[PDB]
Scaffold this active site. Structure first.
Site: not given
Lengths: 268, 268, 268, 268
Positions: C157, C164
């Site tokens: 990720y 995020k």
């Protein structure tokens, strides 16, 4: 058709009509739920209070420190909801700390006998009520407990903060057990609410340094909260509990939902 | 001149030479500290173990559930460190949960009598030892307790996790009291360490589903840790405790320092 | 009467019918909401997808990197919802990171030009859409963005995790601004969902060490989750977004609600 | 023999003698470290400042937005520390946000061009300096960056808060890479420090609502901190950085150590 239409929900913690559980019960009934209420020690007096709810509801005796009460609770709930029926929700709204553990009394001066009683009633009972009632809860059901964010220490709340930290940990383990039944377990961390119990602590601190700290503490919530905070308005907290009792947060468990105006997300 | 040269430090929790407190004591002595040790119930046997430390140290009886022991602890420490001298450090490394509260026993089956005993010894005693010893601690001193990260639930650790959550909350309140004395209060959240107590739990889970979960749990620490994790090597944890006992983290209090290989910062 | 009956809600992020935003839009319409949709670059193709929603909805062009699009967005929304009407909800479901920032590509090898584009689209745009649309949102309204818990690092990720983390911080500041309008701002941190974008990353990692890590990462969610996790079932996440768009969490803002099966509350 | 005796440590971020990095460098030298310093754009002026350190140190040009500077940094460090020698420590103390992103300027009015520059310098550069220097760092080495707790939003700090949230995420990924080299990566979250840069923001807010908020924000740190907080005394923060550069926290990585008086552990 309301948010909780036809759902059978057991609600503990109604002491006065300022109790958070009173307003949880009221909103749940406004949303179509069928309630079972619990109380201890003041049953005739509690019924006079619960009469003021919009709808009638059975009231069952439950001292969470009494093993026999817990051993028979599921059977007694079935007696009032009917053979073959189960609960869809469980609301834990019992929190208690003896006077030595809060307020103006020094943190170091609370004897463990008092702290232990508070942790029994405020934290362990969340597990023992789940143990008693999960065998009669429906898949997709919801257990909700009341929290007050203990991640940072604060004046006056003292050992009750410790009990809430313990409760948050217990909730994560209850979620592991509840999951086997298809049941969620969560807490609602509310901002400060003017119950008669909290008002007695605040009132007993008037003129003392703890009362000055409590005032600054309470005033900070509404200031920090981007949408404000009204300590005399428990309805936003009650609605949040009903949200978790519904099936609109179906993938949330072992968790903590904050109904605090957003205060805990802001430093000032 | 070592990291703790001349510092007087009380160290609790030495049960065997696998105890974390044994290695804390060893490193502290390697770094020049003068120790006072505590124990209960096995004093002659504990002295045989503490003889294996690099330097001699007085051993004092302390049952943290005994109010009289706590009431006299400061006086008895002064007896061995000398009139007009004070402690610079306090190491809390006592953690205990009855067998019903950990391991293969179901979470819901632990009676509160057992949970309460575990929380008394593992969490409340951090406050009561601080209450007893802060009056004889020096400004700039340091109280350190041992933690095991309870922010997420996990198999087998069960009610000991709840007790650690309570301890973290107690630490934040002890920090408020200790600050009045110029004393810091912090916890070290260690990765898993193979003490004889933890090995007894793991060993008693062999062949059971909890033992499978424990194995996966332990193996995950070394995997997640970007620098690895060795459960048989308590020295990195002992050094971390000594770091907090020194004056090299002088603005850290009420806090939790992780000595876990970084495992808790990684999902996989 | 549904949960969002008559509420006017703008929904961004519909790329395919596997997009989380597609299912958010579907559930919102099932619950009585009137939607305005946005897209960029593939408008004719997006309309073919949004035709498969239960109800018709206007589709407006919005490139969040285009200042002119943002400067006219409120006016263009009013054109389709009517003079004197305002939005009750805003759903931000746009997340993007160039290929160098995710998957098998080494973390250190992503040029900042790519990282910056990803943070612009994934995090800054949450603030700039709130800036554009708060002037035409109703008191009691709700802004919801999509999150993927970045509190712990994880394989593959990579820089999307960083984006995020930035988004979570932006959300807390948007909440401060939205509060002036009586509007809440929250994120839903979902478990992994098999969108075509994420499937392309996972697929491109097949046979590589990152793909092995991704598999272990995904399998861990359903294992950790006390109620399980189905990566092919976005409906529980969509319902959670609709919960926040309703008025059933009226005291929650600046916050993060987890729709992840409870996975993030459990270590194993 | 000091805490960092003989350790070779690169220190970035010395702008004035009020810079945190100036005091980190001073304490490190007091503890026996051999430093390499970096700067950009004001090299003759920076040397006049670094002359005021207790010991001499080479000063190397480093614009972290310049790819060529980063591509040659390791070679240029080796030129001054000698063939076959490596760094034991790396201190990242560069943080910058254009004026639109902080202070009295509204959060929504910062153009992304400015936010992106701030995130490049404040967060991405932590990864790109680690990429450049890990190949010449020794096993057991330590990378430390400076943080300001962004977990809760606050007035005035605005997009710099967002950049710090991004940095915390970057640190967790740098730790994964650094672990392959036996190197730790951590941040120190400091309380507010009166640097000339922060004083310029605070000063430019005098008489404005943001300045009132900043004053209340700063005064809250010393109040919340159980051991107090002195914004004019950077030495406790510098000592904490040196603690992480030593080998006394050898099992801590990907993590955040708070040097803030304990303020972040207390609500009031």
């Amino acid at each position: 058709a309301g948010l909780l239409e036809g759902k059978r929900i057991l609600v503990s913690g109604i002491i006065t009509d300022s109790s958070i559980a009173f307003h949880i019960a009221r909103v749940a009934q406004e949303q179509g739920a069928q309630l079972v209420l619990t109380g201890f020690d003041r049953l005739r007096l509690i019924q006079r209070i619960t009469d003021r709810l919009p709808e009638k509801a059975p009231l069952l005796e439950l001292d969470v420190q009494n093993d026999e009460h817990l051993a028979t609770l599921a059977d007694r709930v079935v007696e009032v909801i009917g053979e073959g029926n189960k609960l869809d929700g469980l609301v834990h709204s019992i929190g208690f700390m003896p006077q030595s553990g809060m307020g103006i009394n020094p943190f170091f001066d609370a004897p463990y006998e008092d702290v232990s009683k508070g942790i029994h009633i405020s934290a362990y009972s969340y597990a023992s009520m789940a143990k008693a009632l999960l065998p009669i809860m429906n898949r997709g059901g919801s257990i909700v407990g009341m929290d007050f964010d203990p991640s940072r220490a604060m004046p006056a709340y003292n050992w009750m903060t410790v009990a809430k930290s313990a409760l948050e940990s217990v909730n994560r383990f209850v979620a592991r057990e509840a999951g086997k039944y298809g049941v969620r377990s969560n807490l609602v961390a509310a901002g400060p609410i003017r119950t008669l119990a909290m008002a007695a602590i605040v009132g007993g601190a008037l003129g003392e340094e703890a009362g000055a700290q409590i005032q600054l503490l309470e005033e900070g919530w509404d200031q920090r909260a981007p949408i404000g905070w009204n300590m005399k308005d428990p309805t936003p907290v009650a609605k949040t509990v009903c949200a978790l009792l519904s099936e609109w947060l179906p993938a949330t468990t072992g968790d903590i939902i904050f109904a605090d105006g957003g205060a805990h997300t802001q430093l000032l």
